[PDB]
Amino acid sequence: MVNPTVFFDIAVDGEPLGRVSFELFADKVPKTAENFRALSTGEKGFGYKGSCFHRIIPGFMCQGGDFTRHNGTGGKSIYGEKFEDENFILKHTGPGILSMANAGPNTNGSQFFICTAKTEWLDGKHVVFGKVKEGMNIVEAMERFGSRNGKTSKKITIADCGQLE
Template identity: 65%
Template sequence: MFCRLKSTPPSLFSSLNCSFNPATRSFSSTSAAMSAITKAFFEIQYAPVGSSAPKTGRINFNLYEGDVPKTARNFRELCTKPEGEGYKGSGFHRIIPQFMLQGGDFTRHNGTGGRSIYGEKFPDENFKHKHTRPGLLSMANAGPNTNGSQFFITTVVTSWLDGKHVVFGEVADEASMQVVKEIEALGSSSGAVRSSVKPTIVNCGEE
């Protein structure tokens, strides 16, 4: 079953209150106000727009383990598993500019697969955190209580996903967000990746 996120009509973006600089699309971390933050990272191989030469960029994450421990643990442990059993070797199969980057399907690599550390699926833990800014890490799903391993990283405010997808972390720093922006630019309105080098997680882990 596809893990699909419902995008919003372009006209809706103008009515959302973004908490980031529209010129730079930079953001401010809110992790200081939270307890029990754990950390994870991806090293991603991709070719930026205008280049056929692959490069490797790193995205650091803060995980809200104090607020959504089960969901954060699922992501963190999948970052530590070997290729074929977790995120290492998997790619971003769906990228929509001005929306999000979606990945985490390490079994079928097309949005129809993946599994959690608890079994194929696990329930929505809570909706304490909202999709209020770019750089948030949230669970992709195929409906209520169908969380597996697929996730997405927001690149804008996505308030219409509140109460439907569990936010469990954030991009940790501006250098990491720059990598997110470069990968976002490889996407399309359909979600298809416009690059001969599919953005792939070549290494990942916890810190």
């Protein structure tokens, strides 16, 4: 049951920066992985294309996924406004881990974060569901546009996104 691969073509304001591809661990967390996959293709009619990364903290993570309010207060899943934490099999083992952002237990929507470091203090509270397959260097480039409080300086946008595998 092949795990899917999705990609994001990142843009800084308007400038094309590059492509990041992700393997989604549908063999561990199928529902969380399906949500992200369908939001990447935009197949349910809504999704990530055009949304921006609203909070980048260098040496920690890049947070995106709020395509409804663009500031961290929104987003939604393909299952409804929120869905349960599927399970906590996977841990935030290092850079490139992709995990769900949430506002306490069972509040998963569309927001996610790509870790640029190992964040084990988050284990057991955020569901890990993917990993950067190629393009880590593009995430390391994105880091440069954040700050300690998380505010960006340029608009980091998902110019295009879809499925590959």
